[model samples]
Target chain A: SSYTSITKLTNLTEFRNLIKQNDKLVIDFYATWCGPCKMMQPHLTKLIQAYPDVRFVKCDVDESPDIAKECEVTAMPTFVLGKDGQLIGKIIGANPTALEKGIKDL
Target chain B: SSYTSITKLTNLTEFRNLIKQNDKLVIDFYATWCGPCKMMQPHLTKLIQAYPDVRFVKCDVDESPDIAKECEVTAMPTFVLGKDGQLIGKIIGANPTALEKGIKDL
Candidate 1:
């Protein structure tokens, strides 16, 4: 549990800071009511633990619609992988394999 | 592998048939290029194994835009739970906790 470090991004400033602060950042865009998002939570928590060096963050689409829109996230539970403050990859659904692969690849 | 039953709905007619034949059905709307959809794939496969009584289906939004539109699915990886030919519940994103809860509640 202690190994899993995740930041809940509440606003654009924090979102920008997260990308700026990390060399590799993975942000999960989710909605509280989304089912697959709820399902993916535990695995994501574990992933955070597994990849402690990587910045794992959560962005509520409703809370930060502007960022979500800017990122072109029309899908729920979308994971954006950024490097050096730029998007390097994306995972558009609740697919864990792709998430892990994205993490490993990035 | 056999325990997990998933149907790919390519057309609206097939989609209608799947909802009709099963007392309970869970549909995942996805796209081929979507990363989250890819990440959610394995978990969905496992969920299919866990819930043998429920029908697990996939609809490619690009392949079947009409049905996805009809369902009001503007987001990728939206899960719709149907019972008795009617949509009983919906998971708007890739939330597995909510997905399992939805399955148990339905």
Candidate 2:
């Protein structure tokens, strides 16, 4: 299985489908101008290499407004994990520990 | 017509209903714990007295998550002006001049 991939989600239907297609899904809600979001990418990439079993997807919030709004993604750099169509873990802020813990738990 | 009132909206249906009932509306998307939102209250109150034809309402984003999500209100103290159910102008931040202009133009 692929470790990580850049996912551009425009519709809620597509997002839901992606979640169904993967066993463990990590969705990153990011914006263009967010400074911390850019910094977190390298860390996420490195983590993906370490964890090959998981699916990591980067979704641009600006480009995918409809999906972002439906998900209730207010803040930038939101890290969310879902399994079986339910939210397993979510980190609203740019906290590395919280994100790492969430991924590790899933 | 009443100038201003504290409107509590819970769902998307109720929010749209409120907008339809008012000819000129100023919906403030705020949070219960936001400091700047509290500061902006007096200014809104003062504006209410000056403009009786416009109905100014406050909807808490924390309490009314559905409405906030539907309206795409991410920021605190977001001021939106609508006339006849269509958006006229909006102020995303606590900008006094923009808020004033939006209200004045309405």
TM per candidate comes to 0.51, 0.50
Total backbone collisions for each predicted model: 25, 0
- Best prediction by DockQ: 1
Best by TM-score: 1
Query: DockQ of each candidate's interface versus the true one?
Result: 0.04, 0.02
Which 10 consecutive residues of model 2 chain A have the lowest summed lDDT? A1-10
Compared with the true structure, what per-residue lDDT tens digits does model 2 show for residues A1-92? 22245655667778778877777778889998999888788778877776676778877888988767755677889876765444444567
Tens-place lDDT per residue, model 2, B1-106, is 2214566567777778888888898988875434456667778887777787887887877567677777777556788888987766668866767888888887
Interface RMSD of 1: 7.8
The C-alpha RMSD in Å for every predicted model, in order, reads: 13.6, 14.1
